Design a protein around this nucleic acid. Structure first.
Ligand SMILES: [Zn+2]
Lengths: 141, 117, 76, 60, 49, 94, 177
RNA sequence: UGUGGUGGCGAUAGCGAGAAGGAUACACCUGUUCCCAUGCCGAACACAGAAGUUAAGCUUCUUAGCGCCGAUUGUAGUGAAGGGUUUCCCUUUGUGAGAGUAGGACGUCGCCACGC
RNA sequence: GCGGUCGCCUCCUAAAAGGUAACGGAGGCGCCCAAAGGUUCCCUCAGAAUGGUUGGAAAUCAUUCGAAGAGUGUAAAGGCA
RNA sequence: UGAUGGAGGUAGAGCACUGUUUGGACUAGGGGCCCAUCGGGUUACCGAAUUCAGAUAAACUCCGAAUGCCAUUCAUUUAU
């Protein structure tokens, strides 16, 4: 149970949510980034697999931009228990992402290792991605 | 230290009394206005906001002092100019004060000179 | 079980007479808790922030500059 | 000035070893001796002889 | 601590009013100036004995 | 100098869903002397203005007339493709 | 008394000759002296407050207030409403008589004789000198004083700079070191 | 015409920053014997005055720095009508956002007295 | 069946009038005040900056900045400078 | 149905308070090791204070839709 990122509570349970679509919320700091094209949950461990697939084949530096935390609690029942009684134990820290967001921004290293490690993290996410720079820019920094 | 101003609190207490009671439809306001060397008193109305009658400090009859004497003179002039228009049931103001010192001097001179309260 | 299973009864607030109407002697207008609307002409406030129409007239709502609202009754 | 609450003091003459700095007040009282016009017509007995040059920060 | 108490009108002798006190504060007999319907004047009312 | 100026209605209605599937640009223009209209553009010419000078060019509106020197204010765009919508202008002139 | 008349004679024209006003209604004044005596041991006994109020009433012709807690600190053992300190103010000659007392009697009878510590500035000239001793003043009985406390005194003027407060109190005695 | 006094109108009235002012007004400043006052305190609070000075308050004027109010519109979202997978997305059709605005904006209107 | 629950009150689910169930998601009640009531007057907090013996992270202060960041006998909402 | 004024915090926006949490600049000089039996706190956090950019709400709000609901000596058409 390798959960990286948690919350200080002030609630325990949350409703099982609903997701339709989002917009905007583009490249801020890195020189390269993803775009999700789906709408699902993203649990704890997938971002740690993203960490490792970033950091190993990003050899010797190059900055990372983790941008998305889990916030919401899952639950789950107990096995062998009928339908009926209250919500089970909080087992999961899961935050959803819809199409158009950016999981990670990347700068500091030329494009080869960038597209490498971005492919290397994308296999350990259930989301088809794209690969975006600061492609369309209203200012030349 | 800045000196806090004084007329601000006086007009605050005006606001509290008017927001308690003005109600001046046919029973207008009496008016109690201080300065250093002067007493101003008017009769101001609602809804239109037009005065009815006043009594000047140092433009008219006699003096007096920081006393009842100017104030009784003002009360006489105000009650007589109210009797000119045939008005007997005015509602007071209070300035920003209690009824002690340049107040009941005006008040009872307005009372027993022929104005019902 | 869980510790839930604890609710009250719906005490049925909300306005019970809209604008442009005519009112009997002293009936309810918009039953509040907490002053959300300050009174106006011919309006009474009871012991439970309920609102009155004394003179039989026309209920209308107003501003208070920017801040909050005023019931207003006007006779014929 | 609220009645019946004040302590006791008068313009007490302050004697000195030099020149008689006799021009102030004091709470404690005593025998009324230097009832004088240029000074208090009160007690002198507070007779602090520090001349303000007894520790002459002003003079040396 | 608090007991259901009735005021006694010491004039007409009728168990007229009713109120509540806290007997940790007041070990006395409660005496106020209240009204009576049978007598129509403000009357000293005591605690029932 | 040689550009595309179309015109629109006050409310073109919920035909606006169609468009986006055609290749249209619905947007805002409000300016300095001439206040404010709706005006279409196309996508494959703004990117050719991006290679003319860059991202801070000089815009001259052509109905074979004089110019509205707009100096583009915002562009935040679509998910899932990343292309042109909501092209706000501002004619901060000479 | 005296220092009013020094303002008449020499101080206020020197303040004009330095600061170059457009009226004497532009001039800084001296108004308040605020005095504080807390105990803290009045958790145990307020008889320190008793004789402290006795000492203060023998200093000037007042009796102070009895200032309560306005907090609740278990570290100091405080609830609300626990009386702590006492407040004396000064006006009139009791300004100037106490000023000349500080010139003449008390302050040149304080051990480790150096003068007056300077840095009480507050930016806007608010010199508070937490006094070491209680036995300084000639009104003090050695046979009554039981602690080795001193005095909290707030002095408030209308001096607008620390330079103005320096020049005024230097022209009212106060040997800054 | 200026001041003072008392009125409404969403601060477009406001905050800042700066410049000028005392005929009168107002306000500070003189003192408390007198009414009254302090959980100490003529600082306020009430009084008895009129020495000074425009210093501050206050009045006029500037200023889009702060703050407020903002069209045109794009788009999300959404009623009615439809279709594929039903997680959702798309389309006919009315109706529109919040943002980011361009700009306005350092007031308008009421009554009386006095100086006039 | 064993467990747990059975009356009342504040929120959310509750689909922007009301209303609307679940062994749904939350908290409290079975009192208290002789003034914590009524009237009439007077006052403005939370904080933050600096100087200041006992005095320290803060006891009492003083000066300024400061729109609620406090309080409102008791649960929660809604109010109230 | 059309016209008219009204009840209000669902949809999206959802930052201003209550919240969650990201990276950049500053820090109060704190916690040391101390160089100590005052030049540096070099160096480790610079955290609180701030402070810039970017997000997140069923028990968040600076704001705020259609649509339904309530009314009208209203207008049309029909039978309630
Ligand atoms: Zn009786």
């Amino acid at each position: 149970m390798l959960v990286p990122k948690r919350v200080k509570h002030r609630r325990e349970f949350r409703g099982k949510m609903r997701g339709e679509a989002k917009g905007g919320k583009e490249v801020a700091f890195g020189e390269w980034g993803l775009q999700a094209t789906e709408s699902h949950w993203i649990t704890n461990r997938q971002i740690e697999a993203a960490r490792i697939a970033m950091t190993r084949y990003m050899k010797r530096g190059g900055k990372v931009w983790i941008k998305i935390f889990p916030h919401k609690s899952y639950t789950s029942k107990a096995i062998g228990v009928r339908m009926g009684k209250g919500k089970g134990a909080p087992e999961g820290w899961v935050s959803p992402v819809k199409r158009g967001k950016i999981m990670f921004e990347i700068a500091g290293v030329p494009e080869e290792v960038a597209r490498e490690a971005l492919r290397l993290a994308s296999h350990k996410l259930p989301v088809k991605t794209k690969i975006v720079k600061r492609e369309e820019m209203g200012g030349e920094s | 230290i800045t000196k806090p101003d004084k007329n601000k609190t006086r007009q605050k207490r005006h606001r509290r009394v008017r927001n308690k009671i003005s109600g001046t439809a046919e029973c207008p306001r009496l008016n109690i206005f201080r300065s250093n060397k002067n007493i101003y008193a008017q009769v101001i109305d609602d809804v239109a906001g037009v005065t009815l009658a006043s009594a000047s400090a140092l433009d008219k009859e006699i003096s007096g002092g920081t006393k009842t004497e100017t104030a009784a003179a003002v009360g006489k002039l105000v009650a007589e100019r109210a009797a000119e228009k045939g008005i007997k049931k005015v509602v007071f103001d209070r300035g920003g004060y209690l009824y002690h010192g340049r107040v009941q001097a005006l008040a009872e001179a307005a009372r027993e000179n022929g104005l019902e309260f | 079980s869980t510790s839930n299973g604890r609710d009250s009864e719906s005490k049925r607030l909300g306005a019970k007479s809209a604008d442009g109407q005519t009112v009997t002697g002293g009936s309810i207008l918009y039953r509040q808790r907490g002053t959300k609307i300050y009174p106006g002409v011919n309006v009474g406030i009871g012991g439970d922030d309920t609102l009155f129409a004394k003179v039989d007239g026309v209920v209308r709502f107003e501003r208070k500059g920017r801040d909050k609202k005023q019931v207003s009754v006007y006779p014929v | 000035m609220k009645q019946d609450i004040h302590p006791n003091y008068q313009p007490v003459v302050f004697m000195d070893s030099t020149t008689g700095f006799k021009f102030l007040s004091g709470s404690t009282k005593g025998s009324s001796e230097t009832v004088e016009w240029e000074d208090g017509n009160t007690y002198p007995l507070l007779r602090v002889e520090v001349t303000s040059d007894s520790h002459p920060f002003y003079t040396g | 601590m608090r007991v259901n108490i009735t005021l006694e009108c010491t004039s007409c002798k009728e168990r007229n009013y009713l109120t509540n006190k806290n007997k940790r504060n007041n070990p006395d007999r409660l005496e106020k100036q209240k009204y009576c319907p049978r007598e129509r004047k403000v009357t000293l009312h005591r605690e029932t004995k | 100098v040689q550009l595309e100026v179309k015109e629109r209605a006050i409310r073109p209605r919920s035909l606006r869903n169609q468009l986006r599937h055609e290749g249209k640009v619905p947007a805002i223009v409000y300016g300095y002397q001439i206040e404010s209209t709706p005006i279409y553009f196309e996508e494959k010419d703004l990117s050719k203005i991006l290679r003319e000078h860059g991202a801070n060019t000089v815009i001259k509106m052509t109905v074979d007339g004089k110019n509205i020197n707009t100096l583009m204010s915002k562009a935040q765009l679509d998910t899932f493709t990343g292309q042109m919508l909501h092209v706000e202008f501002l004619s901060v002139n000479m | 008394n005296r220092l009013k008349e020094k303002y008449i004679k020499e101080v206020t024209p020197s303040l004009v000759e330095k600061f170059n006003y457009s009226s004497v209604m532009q001039t800084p004044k001296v108004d308040k002296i605020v005095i504080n005596m807390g105990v803290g041991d009045a958790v145990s006994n307020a008889k320190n407050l008793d004789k402290a109020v006795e000492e203060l009433a023998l200093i000037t012709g007042q009796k102070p207030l009895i200032t309560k807690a306005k907090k609740s600190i278990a570290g100091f053992r405080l609830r609300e409403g626990m009386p702590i300190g006492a407040k004396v103010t000064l006006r009139g000659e009791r300004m100037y008589e106490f000023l000349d007392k500080l010139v003449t009697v008390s302050l040149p009878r304080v051990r480790d004789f150096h003068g007056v510590s300077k840095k009480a500035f507050d930016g806007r000239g608010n010199y508070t000198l937490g006094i070491k001793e209680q036995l300084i003043f000639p009104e003090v009985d050695y046979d009554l004083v039981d602690k080795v406390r001193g005095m909290d005194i707030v002095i408030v003027t209308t001096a607008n700079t620390d330079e103005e407060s320096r020049e005024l109190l230097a022209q009212l005695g106060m040997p800054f070191q």
